[PDB]
């Protein structure tokens, strides 16, 4: 039942597409823009998968296989992967679904990510991976209806508690925090509440179906890409994860075209290709070193309550923060217009607020943008700045105009 | 002596850079625009290498190693490789040296050209190659000071003659043809005559130095790429032609910057990356099938007088001609302006011809270009149409204004 990875992955892309689900931007905007929309989306799913993974394993739909603990691997590979995120312009999974979105930079970013991961795994970088392998923590769980034989450590296994107990506690706390905290609001119809339900459901669909083929794990990104490159370059048979990668690329493309969001897109300056190639290049090193990326360790490993995924997840954000500071330091009169068409995700938001605050009272400020997400984030980032959005105007195919009524 | 190829390639890039020597355009412009500048550079070098190769074989610096004849592989793969040339925006070595210039579409084309060649060699296309290999002609020469043991057939070996005779007859006919024939004029200072001298001197240096490494051949491009990818993705040792692949890029990189020609380049519309993406794939499949590319069979094999290299070099032009039809079917007032900045070199020349033809007597035509070659090819294409070029201007570094006074 190997084709089911394409089936799971096809749903995976559509959830990631219409839900804007990118983990690198989620970590960045709690540090840059104090924006938590995608964190509650993460926290909600993680809580739901916590109960889901144990519940599905309890009945007999899966067994959990936590990743083995490697402090040198989880810490250092976690940080290397965090750097690649901001350099690659998106997470490991985010770039993959971005390929079907028509992002030439995502093609370039994905091309090196698989190659470097291949090189880190078996290629010329295999010395650095084999050296880190001398820090493998031998601590293990034992075979049960919960855990595969010889798997890694968990919160439960250390504590001697039955896995239900921390899973019910932590998920409830997360559900409390996400439901009890103020949220920065956008205008995505596939809002973070329902979107987390689908994301956890597909993950549960991922675990049960992938285990049938022989792969005892949920959603993964690095393992599939390496399997794709191998099959194309050494004629090895494709498996569930590589097919899942294929379904993701198709899945994001289908919805992007149905919504009318699809476009072959170029960066504003040609130097960005050199940047995003390095970004994925780092990600291949870090993801392979840590044993998984923002999906293989975070989305699918954190709700499994596994120490190795929990430890590796930490430095995903440290690198996400580290590379962020290095890098990111109708007739309506219009008083000043600023053109941000062709700019990557944070730029339209960054220069829109730089216009209204460096403007007097009563200014009409025009914002010209050609990317879908920015027309939903800009209206919120100006309401707290006192001002008001006059009208969101639809100009050319895929371009929107925002007129701002500046206050004080 | 593996390192000598980076040196040979380093010279190779500078020769290819300042002479603009791309074989895909050499074949293309004899059918499109009846322009023979680059073919003149080709035929002379073939003659010079016809004499050079046999001369060095006589003393003991080298031996000729013609590639064995396979009628299925040379014809079909040669045709397909010709399709990939036009699609990939240039020949096999024609993108590689262009990587050092700063062209992002060549980086994309290089990514698919290498990976397809690795796939067609041992990856997912090994079935096609394994089937094609059953048609290998068992005609072999014998170990001698002129031919390596069990090599392929040649014009000389077929006729029962000494290698000097066909080399001295065919090269003189090439030399007589090139010098007695009309040549389309350019303003490349590194003219076709001297550049043909240096291109054989590098080619001969490639033979003598590489033969000591254990590879008994001169400049070969597709074989070089696979050695790099094997090393990077399988931790295999690099080799002479793998280093030669690097030296071409590093050699052109030095030459592209000193002349002030370096610039990170993007196409006009994002669609070109997918078009050039297929081009590298076709070239990899074609070059591995053909057993040699624009350099492996034409530049290096044709002067060796080998039957297989001639046969594949016939169909390189047929596929080049096939795909060419599918794809291509200051105070000066200025009366009409034409902007072709960012479009590949044929387009500025063609769109400059379209303006003058659809212009009346006395109109001043402004043509803005951002590629150095077009500022050389346009002035000859304007005097051919009766008109006169007024001044070549320097707007921005790397951008030129061409002012044309049209006659009738
Ligand atoms: C603030 C949160 C709001 C929502 C809250 C939802 C709570 C759901 C579960 C809680 C478990 C609490 C601890 C229960 C301990 C039970 C121990 C047990 O059954 O066994 C103990 C021993 O280890 C073997 O017998
Ligand atoms: C017990 C086995 C399962 C354990 C795991 C699942 C736990 C689900 C519940 C968590 C808290 C949900 C309610 C959180 C508060 C929601 C409403 C809110 O934010 O405040 C409303 C206010 O308290 C009044 O008006
Ligand atoms: C645990 C067992 C699970 C078994 C079942 C597995 C699959 C579950 C859900 C899949 C939803 C896939 C489609 C999600 C919705 C598509 C996107 C959407 O809602 O788009 C709205 C649009 O953006 C408005 O403008
Ligand atoms: C063993 C001895 C024989 C084997 C080795 C023979 C090497 C022959 C040439 C090497 C590099 C030539 C590079 C091209 C010349 C310099 C670049 C040039 O021509 O630049 C002109 C410029 O464009 C004006 O503005
Ligand atoms: C990892 C590298 C992956 C590389 C490949 C990723 C997927 C590319 C998908 C679509 C582009 C081709 C279709 C869109 C072409 C431009 C749109 C257009 O002009 O119209 C097309 C439409 O079909 C009316 O004819
Ligand atoms: C027990 C589990 C309970 C939950 C199981 C969920 C399974 C998936 C169902 C629906 C996906 C989301 C569908 C709704 C998303 C928004 C659709 C919408 O607004 O559509 C607008 C329209 O397409 C243009 O105007
Ligand atoms: C479109 C681009 C996504 C990648 C598509 C190609 C990825 C590699 C597929 C591959 O390995 O194909 C060979 C075959 O699977 C050996 O059994
Ligand atoms: C991995 C292998 C499978 C490839 C996926 C296709 C990805 C792209 C999705 C399809 C392109 C959609 C498209 O071009 O839509 C028309 C466009 O809007 C112009 O009219
Ligand atoms: C091998 C097993 C099969 C694998 C392959 C199956 C392909 C099925 C195709 C399409 C269905 C899903 C289409 C989902 C389209 C996105 C939803 C959406 O956005 O539509 C509403 C719109 O946005 C409002 O403006
Ligand atoms: C338009 C441009 C056209 C350019 C020219 C294209 C010529 C045909 C090329 C490839 C198809 C090959 C199909 C047949 C392949 C071999 C059939 C066969 O017997 O394959 C056995 C197999 O390899 C083990 O079982
Ligand atoms: C053995 C190599 C001989 C090379 C020289 C061949 C004869 C000179 C060429 C004259 C062309 C006509 C010029 C007018
Ligand atoms: C035994 C054989 C030994 C062979 C050893 C190598 C011989 C060839 C070396 C150089 C050729 C000329 C190179 C190009 C020189 C002219 C460049 C030109 O046209 O102009 C350059 C000038 O700097 C513009 O300002
Ligand atoms: C796997 C294969 C790897 C192959 C690797 C080969 C070596 C590196 C290649 C080319 C370097 C080219 C460098 C060109 C630098 C140009 C700098 C320049 O001119 O920059 C202008 C700018 O204005 C300044 O601020
Ligand atoms: C002035 C414009 C250019 C400025 C500089 C641009 C960057 C140069 C860096 C490296 C180039 C490659 C050469 C150095 C490395 C060669 C490969 C090597 O070390 O090979 C070892 C061994 O022979 C096989 O593994
Ligand atoms: C491994 C690290 C490598 C670091 C980098 C090493 C650079 C070597 C320097 C010079 C060789 C090439 C000399 C220049 C050849 C082309 C000259 C040129 O541009 O000729 C036109 C002329 O300048 C118009 O006035
Ligand atoms: C293997 C590839 C090695 C690549 C090594 C770096 C190449 C030059 C990079 C940046 C300079 C950009 C300068 C600004 C744009 C051109 C003017
Ligand atoms: C031998 C297998 C491939 C043979 C056929 C090549 C297919 C891809 C390119 C077609 C033209 C696309 C651009 C058309 C522009 C008008």
Residue numbers in the entry:
A (entry chain B), B (entry chain A): 1 to 329, 372 to 450
Quote the paper.
Recently, a selective thiosulfate uptake pathway involving a membrane protein YeeE (TsuA) in Escherichia coli was characterized. Here, we assessed selective thiosulfate transport via Spirochaeta thermophila YeeE in vitro and characterized E. coli YeeD (TsuB) as an adjacent and essential protein for YeeE-mediated thiosulfate uptake in vivo. YeeD is a cytoplasmic protein that belongs to the TusA (tRNA 2-thiouridine synthesizing protein A) protein family. Finally, the crystal structures of S. thermophila YeeE-YeeD fusion proteins at 3.34-Å and 2.60-Å resolutions revealed their interactions.
We succeeded in crystallizing a fusion protein of StYeeE and StYeeD, designed based on the amino acid sequence of Corynebacterium pollutisoli YeeED, which is expressed as a single protein. First, because a comparison of StYeeE/D and several YeeEDs’ amino acid sequences revealed that C. pollutisoli YeeED possesses the shortest linker, of 40 amino acids, between its YeeE and YeeD regions, we prepared the fusion protein by introducing the 40 residues between the C-terminus of StYeeE and the N-terminus of StYeeD. Second, after attempting but failing to crystallize the fusion protein, StYeeE-StYeeD, we tried crystallization using alanine mutants of the conserved cysteines in StYeeE-StYeeD and succeeded in crystallizing StYeeE(C22A)-StYeeD. However, the resolution was insufficient to reveal the details of the interactions between YeeE and YeeD. The asymmetric unit contains 2 molecules of StYeeED, Mol A and Mol B. In the crystal packing, StYeeD in Mol A is involved in interacting with an adjacent YeeD region, but YeeD in Mol B is not. Each crystal lattice in the datasets was the same, except for having slightly different unit cell dimensions. C22 of StYeeE is located at the interface, implying that C22A affects the interaction. From our X-ray crystal structure, YeeE and YeeD appear to work as a 1:1 complex.
